[PDB]
Amino acid sequence: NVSSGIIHVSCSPNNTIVSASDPGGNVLCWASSGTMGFKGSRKKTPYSAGIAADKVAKTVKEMGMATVKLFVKGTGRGKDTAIRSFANAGLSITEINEKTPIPHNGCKPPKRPR
RNA sequence: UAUUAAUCUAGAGUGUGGUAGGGAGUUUUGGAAUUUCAUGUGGAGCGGUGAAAUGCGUAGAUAUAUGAAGGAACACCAGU
C-alpha cells in the first residue's frame, strides 16, 4: 500500500534472510532459505538466496511496490545473487548501501576453530 | 703503576636557547557493537556443522525500526 520503501537482506555465512519494509520501520514480509523445501546444509548457496529474493520480490509486487532503497547485510557468497534477482526483476531500485553489523574493536568475539 | 702537592678541559655532568615523542600515573568524557529489557511491525522455522544432531522457536523466535540499561574493549589514523 506504499510506493517507496526499503528491503533488507542479511546473507549470513550459514544462511540468508530477506525482508521488505516500509520507511516507517515496520516489516511488510520476509523470506529465507528455510521457507523453501530444501533444508540442512544445502541452504547456504547463492542459488537459494536468489530464489528467496525472487519470491520476496514476487510477493511485494502485488503490494504495489515502487522505488526502493537497498541495505545489504551480512557476509557471504549469496548476497550478490539477490542483487541479480532484483535487477532482473525490473523493480525500481534506486540506492544501494552497506549495513553489516560492523562493530568497533570492542567486545571479544568467539575463537579460532581448530 | 701506586701515594701525595697542585694546574687545564677534550672525559663526564649542570646552564642557555631551540625540539620531538601511543613515556608514566591520577582525574573526567564519547561513540560503535554485543547482550538484556520495553515498544511497534509478523507468522515457522532459527541456530548449527564435512554432513548432522543436543539447543532455541505461535507462550511470536530470527528479522525490521525506536528507546532504556549495564558491562567490556578502543576498527578506519596504523607505517620495511
Side-chain angles (χ1 to χ4, degrees):
Chain A
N1 297 120
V2 71
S3 72
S4 184
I6 311 96
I7 177 157
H8 293 95
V9 60
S10 170
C11 176
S12 187
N14 202 359
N15 207 352
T16 187
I17 190 167
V18 69
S19 303
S21 182
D22 63 358
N26 293 323
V27 298
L28 313 183
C29 184
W30 54 256
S32 83
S33 73
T35 44
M36 283 73 74
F38 57 90
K39 68 154 284 303
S41 60
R42 64 221 81 201
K43 67 184 173 66
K44 43 182 178 184
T45 60
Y47 175 48
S48 175
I51 79 173
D54 291 331
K55 181 179 178 294
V56 71
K58 179 179 73 68
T59 184
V60 66
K61 283 279 195 182
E62 293 83 4
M63 183 278 288
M65 173 46 108
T67 191
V68 61
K69 264 64 187 159
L70 201 43
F71 292 112
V72 65
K73 181 184 175 183
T75 186
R77 267 189 262 156
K79 67 175 72 175
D80 64 352
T81 307
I83 298 284
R84 297 284 74 78
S85 66
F86 273 39
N88 302 12
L91 183 62
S92 313
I93 193 66
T94 184
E95 212 61 14
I96 188 54
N97 204 25
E98 182 36 35
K99 285 215 310 200
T100 191
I102 186 63
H104 307 171
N105 57 5
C107 63
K108 187 162 82 69
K111 59 191 276 174
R112 293 292 86 192
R114 59 90 174 174

